[PDB]
Design a protein around this ligand. Sequence first.
Ligand SMILES: *C/C=C(C)/C=C/C=C(C)/C=C/C1=C(C)CCCC1(C)C
Length: 133
Amino acid sequence: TRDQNGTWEMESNENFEGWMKALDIDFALRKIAVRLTQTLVIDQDGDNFKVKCTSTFWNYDVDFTVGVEFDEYTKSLDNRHVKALVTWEGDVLVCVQKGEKENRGWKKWIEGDKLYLELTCGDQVCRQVFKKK
Ligand SMILES: *C/C=C(C)/C=C/C=C(C)/C=C/C1=C(C)CCCC1(C)C
C-alpha cells in the first residue's frame, strides 16, 4: 500500500536528538522536543499531499506534489533553502532536499497498521514509527 492518509500516533523514536542536532536546532528546543508525543495527519489525494505534524509546543506542516520539484524554505525548522522532490520507489515515498546539508530528506512507508518515517541529515538517521489512530 501507498496509502498514507490518516491520523498517526508516534510509538517509537530512535536517534531523534542526533537528527535535530544534525540540523543545528537549538539545544533548548531539542531538550523539550525529545519529550513530546507527536501526531502526524496526512491528507493524500493523487499526487497532492498535505502533512501536518503536531506536538504541544511546535508544529511542522508541508504541502507537496509527488513528482514536482519545489523550492522550499524550511521555515521555523532550520531557516534554510532547499530544492525538494518527493517520488515513489515502489511503495516507499522518498523526499530528497538538495542544499547545504548532505543526505537530507526522508522516507515514508506503510507496514500494516503502522507508518514508518526515516529522517536523514548528514550522517544521522532518525527512525520513527506511528500507529494509525
Ligand atoms: C513526511 C513527514 C515528515 C517530513 C515529518 C516531519 C516532522 C518534523 C520535521 C518534526 C519537527 C518537530 C521538531 C523537529 C521538534 C518537535 C516538534 C516537531 C515534532 C513538529
